[PDB]
Amino acid sequence: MKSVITTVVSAADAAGRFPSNSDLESIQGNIQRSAARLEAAEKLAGNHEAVVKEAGDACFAKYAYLKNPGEAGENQEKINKCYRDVDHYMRLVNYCLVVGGTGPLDEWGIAGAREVYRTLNLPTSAYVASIAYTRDRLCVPRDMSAQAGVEFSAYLDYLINALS
Amino acid sequence: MKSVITTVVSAADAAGRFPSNSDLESIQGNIQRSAARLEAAEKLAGNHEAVVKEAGDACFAKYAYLKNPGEAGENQEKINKCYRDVDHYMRLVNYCLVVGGTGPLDEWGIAGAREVYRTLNLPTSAYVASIAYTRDRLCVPRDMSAQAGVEFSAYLDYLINALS
Amino acid sequence: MKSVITTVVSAADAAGRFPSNSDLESIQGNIQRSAARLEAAEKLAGNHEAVVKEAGDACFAKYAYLKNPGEAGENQEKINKCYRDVDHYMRLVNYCLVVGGTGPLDEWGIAGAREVYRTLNLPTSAYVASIAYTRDRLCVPRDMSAQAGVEFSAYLDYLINALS
Amino acid sequence: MLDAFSRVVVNSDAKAAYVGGSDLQALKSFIADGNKRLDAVNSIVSNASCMVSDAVSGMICENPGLISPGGNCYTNRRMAACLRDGEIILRYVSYALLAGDASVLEDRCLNGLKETYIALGVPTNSSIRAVSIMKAQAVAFITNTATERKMSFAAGDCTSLASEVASYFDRVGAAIS
Amino acid sequence: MLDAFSRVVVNSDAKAAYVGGSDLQALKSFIADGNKRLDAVNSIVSNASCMVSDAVSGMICENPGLISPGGNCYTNRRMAACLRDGEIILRYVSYALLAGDASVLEDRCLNGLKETYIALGVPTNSSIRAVSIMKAQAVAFITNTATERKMSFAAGDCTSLASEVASYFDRVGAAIS
Amino acid sequence: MLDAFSRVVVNSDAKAAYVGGSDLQALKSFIADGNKRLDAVNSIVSNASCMVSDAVSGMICENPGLISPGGNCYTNRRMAACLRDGEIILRYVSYALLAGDASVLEDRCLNGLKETYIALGVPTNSSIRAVSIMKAQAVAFITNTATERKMSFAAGDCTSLASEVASYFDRVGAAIS
Amino acid sequence: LTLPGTAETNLAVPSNAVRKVQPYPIAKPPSYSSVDSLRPARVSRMDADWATIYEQVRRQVMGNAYVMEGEAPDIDVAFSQLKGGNLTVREFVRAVGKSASYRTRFMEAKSSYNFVLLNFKHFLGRAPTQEEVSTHIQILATSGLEAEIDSYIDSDEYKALFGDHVVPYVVYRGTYLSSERFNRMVKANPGGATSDKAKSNLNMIATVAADLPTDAIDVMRGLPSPITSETLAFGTAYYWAKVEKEASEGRSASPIGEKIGKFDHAPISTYTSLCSYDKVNKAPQISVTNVGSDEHSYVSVTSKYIAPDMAAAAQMLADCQKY
Amino acid sequence: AKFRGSVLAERGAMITKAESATASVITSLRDGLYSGEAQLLTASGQRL
Ligand SMILES: *C(=C)C1=C(C)[C@@H](Cc2[nH]c(/C=C3N=C(/C=C4\NC(=O)[C@H](C)[C@H]4[C@@H](*)C)C(C)=C\3CCC(=O)O)c(CCC(=O)O)c2C)NC1=O
Ligand SMILES: *C(C)[C@H]1/C(=C/C2=NC(=C\c3[nH]c(C[C@H]4NC(=O)C(C=C)=C4C)c(C)c3CCC(=O)O)/C(CCC(=O)O)=C2C)NC(=O)[C@@H]1C
Ligand SMILES: *[C@@H](C)[C@H]1/C(=C/C2=NC(=C\c3[nH]c(C[C@H]4NC(=O)C(C=C)=C4C)c(C)c3CCC(=O)O)/C(CCC(=O)O)=C2C)NC(=O)[C@@H]1C
Ligand SMILES: *[C@@H](C)[C@H]1/C(=C/C2=NC(=C\c3[nH]c(C[C@H]4NC(=O)C(C=C)=C4C)c(C)c3CCC(=O)O)/C(CCC(=O)O)=C2C)NC(=O)[C@@H]1C
Ligand SMILES: *[C@H](C)[C@H]1/C(=C/C2=NC(=C\c3[nH]c(C[C@H]4NC(=O)C(C=C)=C4C)c(C)c3CCC(=O)O)/C(CCC(=O)O)=C2C)NC(=O)[C@@H]1C
Ligand SMILES: *[C@H](C)[C@H]1/C(=C/C2=NC(=C\c3[nH]c(C[C@H]4NC(=O)C(C=C)=C4C)c(C)c3CCC(=O)O)/C(CCC(=O)O)=C2C)NC(=O)[C@@H]1C
Ligand SMILES: *[C@H](C)[C@H]1/C(=C/C2=NC(=C\c3[nH]c(C[C@H]4NC(=O)C(C=C)=C4C)c(C)c3CCC(=O)O)/C(CCC(=O)O)=C2C)NC(=O)[C@@H]1C
Ligand SMILES: *[C@H](C)[C@H]1/C(=C/C2=NC(=C\c3[nH]c(C[C@H]4NC(=O)C(C=C)=C4C)c(C)c3CCC(=O)O)/C(CCC(=O)O)=C2C)NC(=O)[C@@H]1C
Ligand SMILES: *[C@H](C)[C@H]1/C(=C/C2=NC(=C\c3[nH]c(C[C@H]4NC(=O)C(C=C)=C4C)c(C)c3CCC(=O)O)/C(CCC(=O)O)=C2C)NC(=O)[C@@H]1C
Ligand SMILES: *[C@H](C)[C@H]1/C(=C/C2=NC(=C\c3[nH]c(C[C@H]4NC(=O)C(C=C)=C4C)c(C)c3CCC(=O)O)/C(CCC(=O)O)=C2C)NC(=O)[C@@H]1C
Ligand SMILES: *[C@H](C)[C@H]1/C(=C/C2=NC(=C\c3[nH]c(C[C@H]4NC(=O)C(C=C)=C4C)c(C)c3CCC(=O)O)/C(CCC(=O)O)=C2C)NC(=O)[C@@H]1C
Ligand SMILES: *[C@H](C)[C@H]1/C(=C/C2=NC(=C\c3[nH]c(C[C@H]4NC(=O)C(C=C)=C4C)c(C)c3CCC(=O)O)/C(CCC(=O)O)=C2C)NC(=O)[C@@H]1C
Ligand SMILES: *[C@H](C)[C@H]1/C(=C/C2=NC(=C\c3[nH]c(C[C@H]4NC(=O)C(C=C)=C4C)c(C)c3CCC(=O)O)/C(CCC(=O)O)=C2C)NC(=O)[C@@H]1C
Ligand SMILES: *[C@H](C)[C@H]1/C(=C/C2=NC(=C\c3[nH]c(C[C@H]4NC(=O)C(C=C)=C4C)c(C)c3CCC(=O)O)/C(CCC(=O)O)=C2C)NC(=O)[C@@H]1C
């Protein structure tokens, strides 16, 4: 959605011009970066259930007060929706690593979150604690490459800056 | 300030163009009409003490109730305002014959007049009878010429229609 | 579409006012002018085969480079459209002397003319070479009267000033 | 705005005087020389594209530091804006020649041109030269003494319109100074 | 609005699935012939003013009743809009060749073009001839088989980029008929 | 509005000169140390909501006369409008760091800001302290000498980017004052 | 009331604390537009008088309101300061939109979707998209009436098209940002004697600007174009479709049958269960309340309720390989 | 007209080539070429 390609074919469309020589030069930078972030997305796609069951309970280790009766974890089935909420964010991190920008994160996960989590009383501080843990469990030669770990970590703290 | 010259130069300025042939020949109609309306303006200028005293008492000879107490005429000066208020309306008709349009009658005599006389309780029907006495006074070889009297009649019942 | 009549009934419609004594005076000027422009419209509409044949090759005697290969009129079907392109413009001058304004020349001959001739690579200087030949060819007592040739030569350099 | 027929009725409105036959003889003589005024706007607007382009090219060829980099008529965007600025001025003069007084040149064009050209950086002394060439072209077109163009006129004198249109072109130079 | 990378993630959000590894080598092959996609858009947009003038005037020469009084390309006012109408079409099919799918073509140009043209009087089966001349011009440029302008490329084969740019020109004729 | 490459070609346009081998070499070093510039923007925009919440609350702990009534950051409404005021300034600085000069910062953020804060009564000396803590925060993250967070880079010297970002933050302080 | 020279109020960007009023009106957009040569000219502040300006504000910004001589005294106050130089005609339509006369005939008498559709017609002279609707309808839930009107006038679209000295009007551009942006502008803006007053809901553009599909009906677009573009299409050819359209735009027929919601039903002879088609899919709607001794447990036979055709997916989706 | 159209590019290109030679012989004469002791020892280099 908000990729490299759509942000230059919509600026050509609003001025009413053909794709220029500077518009093709932005797609040239999409060539050299695609080796880094599609091995950061292929790594996340085959490892996704392991990384959300270790970043999901980093919320509950840190914020353990929200398992009391009266809070956002009353029973067992809310905690399985609490893992379902954090598996949705890792899918959109995987979708925004394929596309090349923050397209799927902005239109599907960020927009509307200020009103849903406020009215359903789910704390944004305890969503950030699940995303800040998996940013810091990454070390750049073990899990991926060097620049694969940059662009995986670049879309994670964009989500933390959006939610806080 | 609304004649045949200022309606074509404020219509060509709105489109941003030079005075073309349709603008140049609508002022040809201000050449072959001005022999009549400048004749009828000269007869109004040299007779304006006479044609307000034939006409201004006609509102008191017909709407006779205004000279009663608690009314629009109590003293001689309020009657002397009424021969002054109609002499302004004969001065502006003299202004319309020399300009060649309905310029000074709109900008000085008609605009604002409906929310003056409603406030000050002056009847507009007692204005019209002083104008409509003057409209049927026209005797076509006697007062002015035959084509001078047509344009003199036209500005008088534009004023009646704006006061009706 | 742009006349003496249409400008004064659109200035009245924009204010929401009646036909006053101003715009009645301006169509008086359409009476004294249409004796003189309807014989320029009559002289053009019975002599138009001769006046576009001798104006078309005043273009090609000034610009003989247009008959070269790759240029604007390079074969006989493109030379025949040039004499059609000139005859289209002389017919709209005949419509402007009948209407009495620059109406048919504006919306059928001039609007979009700069877009078409820059896309199809037609020189506008070789269009004004055909129009300004007929402006200078006109003799004042021979071809028409004096004031028929004032009106004929005024719509010709309306067309020159819109193309130059 | 105001034409010559209604300039004399705002003077009569300041004393509430009926405009009679004393000051009408100036204004009956307006319609006597009324065909001469209509041939004089026709000789201006027929040659109006040649008058604009010759005036700015004579301004360029007498001050050629406007074409130098950092000049004001430097690029294509600024030379086209000077040609567009210069045909506004010829348009609003020919309204005021057709009306009779300059009450539309002063309110619709010149009211706020001096402080507009200072905030833009337009040189004012070159703008006097572009309208003084246009003043010299206009008095050569309505007195029929242009060297490369002759139009067909009736016989008579037309020097009281040439002195009138020189006063309209000198009001332009007095406002932007 | 969507490129080829966003097409496969709105196909995999519908299954609630991650974009894995077998749905990437059809997308890593998009990047590998990515320099030929960039040369193919460049050879359309370079000689594109010759494309929309040869297509419209070659549509005129096969139906010369659009030039007759009553045709829809009669005056200068309508011919200037027809040459402008044709280069919106060439603009949006080069946005769709650069991106890799026709979602900016299907949304911002073709959704509502049929009801625009029916309400305005445009002959909708003479407009398909101007798009089908433009399809023949575009596949002769990105296979370097034009007879009057050759361009300089590397050696190889672009017959699948020419095969999908014909599939965007066919989508214009199917949204208009 | 401009970047570092178009700052070069507006200097050569003043002399009507071709930009060639003398001052091409200053641009070939801009491209060569160009991945250093893109890591340095990326570290600013990744710590941006901690960085603006610490510089505004750092301004409060310097001067606690803004929490008393009569203060300008007194209310709950004015604390949100100051914490939004300070992240506009961070957003236009990171445009100017990514571009290469401070002409996006002059035209779109600092035009009329001095006249706004005077007419609002926003105190000037408390605002320079708000961007000075943002200046000390910016040079810590892009020389990687931050005490609470360390990011992974390749090794080398980036001190001339950190001397360029402090000239952008000193441009904001000089125009507010 | 403010000051005898002001160009902008309320200080939304910092660059209006230094901004001057424009000395001259802004030019037209520089694309071609063959339809704009068949249109009347722009009414601006410099060329027109105050009889032309107050009529053309009432013809575009107020629709056709039929404002009487005593009613709207608040617009007479804001016109008294327009003539004094205290606010521009950009600020004069901001005072008109935040007045109580604009509220009582467009806000509190129309609907909520329908209020946003008229504001693009009155202030911008076009019709929105669905993404433009849903950002202007959040301001009517979280910030009220006056912050919604302030987003049109302070937009970038307003100041490029009209600026400070031009009355709003229907701009014909040539190149549009989508082809559906053209023919929804023309549909929303017809000519004389139209007056969106007792048209109590639009209901045709209220469902066409709810889909980025459903390009609307071409006889609502061939109608309000300028003539000499639609002669030889309106003798008696498409003319009768215009007659039907104007009898069904007035009285406001709902498009649940023909335009949105499109269920090709079965044949009539293939069922013959409950006899006639008039009463075929009727089943009763029963609602009880059970509060004390005031209930009115009224069973009504409701109408032909149709399949949602959107809530049935879900079906063949929630049970595709599952269930 | 067809004959000129086919030879216009041939003719202007051969005139540009003849003037590039004159410009080269003038900068070469001033640059010290043709002043050598081996050029003045010939009879055709004395005429030049
Ligand atoms: C450059 C160094 C340079 C010029 C460019 C040119 C500018 C210039 N022109 C005049 C005088 C006139 N120009 C006229 C215009 C036209 N003549 C025509 O017949 C056509 C229709 C039209 C456009 C070419 C006219 C009529 C005049 C007046 C002379 C005359 O009677 O013919 C001036 C002098 C103005 C002045 O300074 O008073 C200048 C500077 N001249 C250049 O030197
Ligand atoms: C001074 C500018 C000229 C000049 C002018 C004279 N014109 C005379 C008569 C005349 N002129 C026109 C042209 C004009 N009238 C129109 O209605 C229109 C178009 C709508 C135009 C362009 C006409 C029709 C007439 C005939 C009327 C008549 O002859 O009375 C003229 C004769 C005296 C006079 O009418 O005042 C003069 C002197 N002649 C010149 O030599 C200079 C260059
Ligand atoms: C501009 C000249 C371009 C260019 C364009 C090409 N045109 C191609 C084919 C083509 N052109 C026309 C129109 C032409 N034929 C006519 O009969 C008439 C007039 C009556 C005209 C103007 C047609 C009909 C076609 C064929 C379309 C089809 O087959 O469906 C073309 C491709 C084939 C070819 O090379 O001829 C191109 C590239 N050619 C150029 O070099 C400049 C850049
Ligand atoms: C958020 C925690 C960031 C972060 C920010 C940094 N802050 C840096 C310096 C700094 N911070 C403050 C405010 C703080 N000090 C106080 O005394 C009070 C309360 C009264 C507060 C809230 C001040 C005053 C300063 C110093 C300003 C200056 O030096 O001119 C800073 C630079 C120093 C350092 O590297 O530690 C940074 C990077 N630090 C982080 O890592 C997270 C992401
Ligand atoms: C880098 C900081 C350290 C290091 C850390 C260790 N990580 C260990 C296990 C581990 N790490 C992750 C997250 C990681 N795996 C992924 O698949 C992805 C995303 C693609 C990420 C960021 C997870 C989920 C786990 C658990 C098991 C696993 O999947 O690998 C680990 C083992 C200790 C343990 O069992 O917890 C260590 C020591 N290792 C290093 O070499 C550098 C210093
Ligand atoms: C006489 C036939 C009427 C009549 C006349 C009165 N008019 C009074 C005041 C008045 N009239 C005007 C309009 C007048 N003034 C102008 O300047 C012009 C046009 C240039 C016109 C037509 C104005 C503005 C005013 C108010 C100013 C003033 O006080 O003079 C008036 C006095 C009203 C009062 O004192 O309450 C009278 C009596 N009223 C009549 O009884 C007959 C019907
Ligand atoms: C024509 C319809 C009749 C006729 C009528 C009479 N009018 C008489 C006197 C008179 N008329 C006016 C108005 C007139 N004078 C003007 O100065 C102007 C406008 C500029 C007009 C319309 C006045 C002021 C007077 C009084 C005397 C005077 O100053 O002229 C009149 C004599 C007495 C009377 O009945 O009012 C008659 C008979 N005369 C005719 O011969 C035909 C039949
Ligand atoms: C002759 C002196 C010219 C010249 C003329 C050519 N005009 C060509 C095409 C053309 N012309 C127009 C405008 C004209 N057609 C109209 O219908 C009307 C108004 C009713 C006017 C004024 C149009 C719109 C077109 C294009 C439509 C078409 O192709 O018929 C033309 C053909 C160009 C081509 O083949 O591509 C020529 C050659 N060319 C000359 O040599 C001098 C400059
Ligand atoms: C030419 C090859 C065609 C033809 C074209 C005409 N199109 C006319 C007007 C027009 N076209 C569009 C669509 C265009 N504008 C856009 O913004 C987009 C998509 C983003 C597209 C595709 C619009 C919206 C309009 C009208 C609005 C305007 O012009 O401002 C047109 C003018 C009709 C007339 O006035 O006579 C023509 C002639 N018609 C043909 O005959 C051939 C087949
Ligand atoms: C098919 C349309 C052509 C053709 C295309 C090929 N191009 C090949 C390589 C190549 N192409 C470009 C042009 C393009 N890339 C850009 O980045 C930009 C501007 C931003 C443009 C205009 C470049 C730079 C390269 C270099 C890559 C390289 O050589 O390593 C190519 C080789 C295979 C490939 O690289 O994919 C082909 C086949 N060749 C043809 O013969 C048809 C006509
Ligand atoms: C906080 C660290 C400051 C401080 C900030 C305040 N700013 C207030 C309002 C305000 N700020 C701007 C400028 C900003 N908006 C932009 O769009 C751009 C760039 C394009 C910039 C730089 C504007 C235009 C406004 C007025 C709009 C508004 O009122 O929201 C503000 C609110 C004032 C109030 O109403 O109380 C505050 C508190 N003030 C401080 O004391 C510290 C130093
Ligand atoms: C008259 C004695 C009729 C009658 C008339 C009513 N018409 C009402 C409102 C109305 N009429 C028009 C059309 C008119 N206005 C225009 O601007 C144009 C053309 C340019 C025309 C032909 C419009 C547009 C409107 C609504 C505008 C507004 O609200 O002011 C009307 C008002 C209805 C009401 O409020 O009750 C009436 C009563 N009704 C009759 O009974 C006789 C037959
Ligand atoms: C009457 C007893 C006075 C007097 C009044 C005049 N006021 C004139 C124009 C005018 N007045 C205002 C201020 C008014 N408008 C407002 O919105 C508010 C407060 C919210 C107020 C107090 C404005 C803005 C204007 C200009 C707009 C307009 O009405 O045209 C005025 C017209 C002047 C003229 O052109 O002749 C008058 C006569 N003047 C007096 O002599 C007494 C003291
Ligand atoms: C939730 C209980 C429903 C459901 C709701 C959705 N409504 C969506 C959009 C929408 N709703 C309205 C009507 C409402 N909004 C208003 O502003 C007003 C009054 C002025 C009313 C009555 C409108 C007008 C709109 C469109 C504009 C907007 O976004 O608010 C909606 C979004 C659809 C989408 O784009 O995906 C949803 C999901 N849908 C459900 O499934 C449950 C049953």
UniProtKB/Swiss-Prot annotation, chains D, E, F:
Transmembrane segments: none annotated. The modification N4-methylasparagine is found at residue 72. GO terms for biological process: photosynthesis. Phycourobilin binds at residues 50, 61. Gene3D superfamilies: Phycocyanins. (2R,3E)-phycoerythrobilin 2 binds at residue 158. It is a peripheral membrane protein. Keywords: Antenna complex, Bile pigment, Chloroplast, Chromophore, Electron transport, Membrane, Methylation, Photosynthesis, Phycobilisome, Plastid, Thylakoid, Transport. InterPro entries: Globin-like_sf (IPR009050), Phycobilisome_asu/bsu (IPR012128), Phycobilisome_asu/bsu_sf (IPR038719). (2R,3E)-phycoerythrobilin 1 binds at residue 82. The keyword Thylakoid applies. It is found in: Plastid, Chloroplast thylakoid membrane. One of its GO terms (cellular component) is phycobilisome. Contains two covalently linked phycoerythrobilin chromophores and one covalently linked phycourobilin chromophore. Light-harvesting photosynthetic bile pigment-protein from the phycobiliprotein complex. Belongs to the phycobiliprotein family. Heteromer of 6 alpha, 6 beta and one gamma chain. This is B-phycoerythrin beta chain. It comes from Porphyridium purpureum.
